[PDB]
Amino acid sequence: LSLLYHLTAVSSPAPGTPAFWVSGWLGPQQYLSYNSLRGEAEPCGAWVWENQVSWYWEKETTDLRIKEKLFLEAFKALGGKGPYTLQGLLGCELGPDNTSVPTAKFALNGEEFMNFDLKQGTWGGDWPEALAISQRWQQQDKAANKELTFLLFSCPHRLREHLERGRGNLEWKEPPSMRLKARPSSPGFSVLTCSAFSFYPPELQLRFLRNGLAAGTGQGDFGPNSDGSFHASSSLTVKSGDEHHYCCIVQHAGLAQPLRVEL
Amino acid sequence: IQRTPKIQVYSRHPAENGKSNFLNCYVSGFHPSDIEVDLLKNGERIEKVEHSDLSFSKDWSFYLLYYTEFTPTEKDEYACRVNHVTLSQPKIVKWDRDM
To answer: What highest taxon heads this organism's lineage (chain B)?
Structure first.
């Protein structure tokens, strides 16, 4: 399990729009939400009902707030009329021997450029506008400090405290709802499209059979529903008329065996 | 750099002409994060329409789900229009049913 925060500031928010915002991810589950027109970190989905160390948010909040000041101040450290886009990937994964591996990288308008080095306790990267922000934040009182705390304490403490308190959530298995439909290609051709609805966790495998023998996985496509369960589909081209010989096979955690999906 | 959106459009559950459902239009790949996304019943954008928070994939590309409740009868044709600095005019993605 990894606890990761996605952090985003843009120089010019479009009107009525968070100049900064963050979401917190326990794995592929979003536990925390924080824009900047609320200055308040809040739980999402199941994680709202977690019995927490309660004074847990007021550290999430103060943390994220302090993080936003610095973010919107990286902009000032910056050259032109822009506008800019500055991104945070910050957290830690926990692994088998009671350990944390911390993570800290940043990008500039979709391009990666800064990283927090923790041996040296700093904000590195040699390409120019790196130096720049590194140094505003460098020469800024105990921010370098406030990070390490974040990265070696606050993160592992938080993650360990989700693992104990919402373990059950982490391991929700919802089986996908299946559907195999056919639509038409060039005459002489048709496409089968096995569509999987709802479903969590995300790992899921689809494939195709013509009379039982394997006849390809297809073109595949993936994305989220809003309860944070998921959606998946694969399409496959077949000889028009050969249709009903085919079927779709879904493989997913919510299932005991694999499952057949007839047309 | 600039990165052009991939757009998908699917219901939450299996489409069943008659029961309450949920239409999702999900946009994923783009950058900058500035984006207008709207859900058309038949032609007109829809009123009560939520949209989850905005995140980004392992290469900083933002992704953004918009969604709304609904109910389809083989009258209506719901679809997803999206405009962004990189698309040249809107793309509309007709919500192909049971896919």
So the answer is: Eukaryota
